Amino acid sequence: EFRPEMLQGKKVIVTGASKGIGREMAYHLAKMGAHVVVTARSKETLQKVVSHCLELGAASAHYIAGTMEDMTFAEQFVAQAGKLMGGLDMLILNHITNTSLNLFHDDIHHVRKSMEVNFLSYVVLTVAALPMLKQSNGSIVVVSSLAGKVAYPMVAAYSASKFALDGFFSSIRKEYSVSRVNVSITLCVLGLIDTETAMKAVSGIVHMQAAPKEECALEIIKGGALRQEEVYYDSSRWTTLLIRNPCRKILEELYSTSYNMDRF
Amino acid sequence: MASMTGGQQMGRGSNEEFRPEMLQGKKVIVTGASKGIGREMAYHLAKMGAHVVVTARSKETLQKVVSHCLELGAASAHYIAGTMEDMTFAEQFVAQAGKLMGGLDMLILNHITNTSLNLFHDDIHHVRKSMEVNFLSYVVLTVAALPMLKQSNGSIVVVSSLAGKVAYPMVAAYSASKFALDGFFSSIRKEYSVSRVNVSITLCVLGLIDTETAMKAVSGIVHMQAAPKEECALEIIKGGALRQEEVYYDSSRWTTLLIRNPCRKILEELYSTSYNMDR
Numbered sequence A: 001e002f003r004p005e006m007l008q009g010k011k012v013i014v015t016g017a018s019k020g021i022g023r024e025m026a027y028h029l030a031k032m033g034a035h036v037v038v039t040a041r042s043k044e045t046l047q048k049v050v051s052h053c054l055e056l057g058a059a060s061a062h063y064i065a066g067t068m069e070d071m072t073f074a075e076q077f078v079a080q081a082g083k084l085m086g087g088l089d090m091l092i093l094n095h096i097t098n099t100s101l102n103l104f105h106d107d108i109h110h111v112r113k114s115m116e117v118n119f120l121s122y123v124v125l126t127v128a129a130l131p132m133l134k135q136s137n138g139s140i141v142v143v144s145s146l147a148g149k150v151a152y153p154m155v156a157a158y159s160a161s162k163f164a165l166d167g168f169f170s171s172i173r174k175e176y177s178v179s180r181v182n183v184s185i186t187l188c189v190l191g192l193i194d195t196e197t198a199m200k201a202v203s204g205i206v207h208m209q210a211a212p213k214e215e216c217a218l219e220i221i222k223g224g225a226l227r228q229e230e231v232y233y234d235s236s237r238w239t240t241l242l243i244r245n246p247c248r249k250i251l252e253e254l255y256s257t258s259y260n261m262d263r264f
Numbered sequence B: 001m002a003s004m005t006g007g008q009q010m011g012r013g014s015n016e017e018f019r020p021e022m023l024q025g026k027k028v029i030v031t032g033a034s035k036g037i038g039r040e041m042a043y044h045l046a047k048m049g050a051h052v053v054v055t056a057r058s059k060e061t062l063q064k065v066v067s068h069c070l071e072l073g074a075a076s077a078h079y080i081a082g083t084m085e086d087m088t089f090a091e092q093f094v095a096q097a098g099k100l101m102g103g104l105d106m107l108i109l110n111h112i113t114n115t116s117l118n119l120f121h122d123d124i125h126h127v128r129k130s131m132e133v134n135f136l137s138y139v140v141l142t143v144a145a146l147p148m149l150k151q152s153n154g155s156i157v158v159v160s161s162l163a164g165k166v167a168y169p170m171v172a173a174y175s176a177s178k179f180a181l182d183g184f185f186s187s188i189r190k191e192y193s194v195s196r197v198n199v200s201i202t203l204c205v206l207g208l209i210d211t212e213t214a215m216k217a218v219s220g221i222v223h224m225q226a227a228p229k230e231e232c233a234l235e236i237i238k239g240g241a242l243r244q245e246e247v248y249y250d251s252s253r254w255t256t257l258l259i260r261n262p263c264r265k266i267l268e269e270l271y272s273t274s275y276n277m278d279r
Ligand SMILES: NC(=O)c1ccc[n+]([C@@H]2O[C@H](COP(=O)([O-])OP(=O)(O)OC[C@H]3O[C@@H](n4cnc5c(N)ncnc54)[C@H](OP(=O)(O)O)[C@@H]3O)[C@@H](O)[C@H]2O)c1
Pocket: A015, A016, A017, A018, A019, A020, A021, A022, A039, A040, A041, A042, A045, A066, A067, A068, A069, A093, A094, A095, A096, A097, A098, A117, A143, A144, A145, A146, A190, A191, A192, A193, A194, A195, A196, A197, A198
């Protein structure tokens, strides 16, 4: 059972926080009394978000502008964010490289860039954040999509990158469990969200109900606060019925009896 | 005689029952073919009377496989050596291979970058290399192969793992790359469907296989029955040959029982009515 008080005084990083869901998450955390450090490329927009967050009641609020294409930036941002706040309780990984619906033909640069930004940078951020999260017994929140669980035409690269996050973060979650790293990892599986970016990209191609981003932002925060492994958020009740893979959980359990990890 | 001959192997039941004759005279590329499963696939294809071009970094090992493929009965057999780390080499290799055989019927993506079982700490270099070699290079090879595959209504065969379907500790980077393959290739399969690109895509989800490389990496860590590489290699060929979307191959019957995800297929089918692609 979530209570907003759970975020009060928590030190939180939100990436891709200048717009959409990331910005909504910043605002919610602001209202909850959390310390926040938001990031994205747009310094000016970040400034506005930061100002509004202080308005909303954030215990403290800062932004650091940069591109997540740059792994050195990602790494230094975490350290700098942690220094401003005196630690870190939750790492919210939410940015993605800009993407539109298109048939895949030969754009290898977009497939590479998508892997770099949507996947690689999440890993670099995690490595950089880990000692602080370990010290706080904090949380990693990874923003994924229904397209990171099942296949859709027109987003091959993006979907590849969301699939990767599941495979990467679900692996380390089992490693953490065994090495006693008390850091939660919540994978967020979102359907269509009414963000300006998504609504434009799907215009005339996709005819489905877009869920509200303010609510989506909250359900993400909630999942992290409760240390849930996965969060499922979609308009359709049929998604919520079919989305889970209980067989996958069973299989992982059955295989767990066939390997020995005492040796690190 | 070949000029006065014609017809088709793929008649009634061919989508269900494999026959070695289905690869006879087919033009096939196998990557990661100097050892393990890839080498075993090369051999099976040889026996079936296929034309084959194999690749891997090791020229001397490739040479040996080629010699043994011709012995075995392959229509023709060649090798081109190089690293799949180099996207230029992956791209030219497809063209070179296609030219040696005068076309392409089946693309078998099987290589990976060397990997061992280790906890993930901070090796970002291995995570990147894993994505480049195990995933990115598959895409570049697919891009290069497509024109020839479209002309022959051929096949793409993607070798994956159980770790490309469910999570395992100690192979975070590797598993990320295998999961990436399913997301990418499953997406283009729906794309080919609607754009009438008659090129099949077979994703192979393999359990532990008794290759030298795997048996070494799991030693003292993993205690499971390993399945034979000869038969694993054949089930891969079969899958591609029959144009099946997914091949599942593992020692446990419990894997075969639980591994499929019918709910994913139902969802994908429900979501298909919510989007218009004509354009
Ligand atoms: N919207 C949907 O329907 C939907 C559905 C499923 C999942 N999701 C997930 O929701 C998360 C947020 O989506 P959204 O729709 O809210 O996104 P959005 O409104 O398009 O905003 C994306 C954010 O990422 C930032 N960004 C873009 N390129 C960047 C780069 N190279 N380096 C650093 N930051 C960069 C953007 O700001 P700057 O341009 O200022 O850098 C912006 O703050 C994503 O991970 C996405 O996969 C969304």
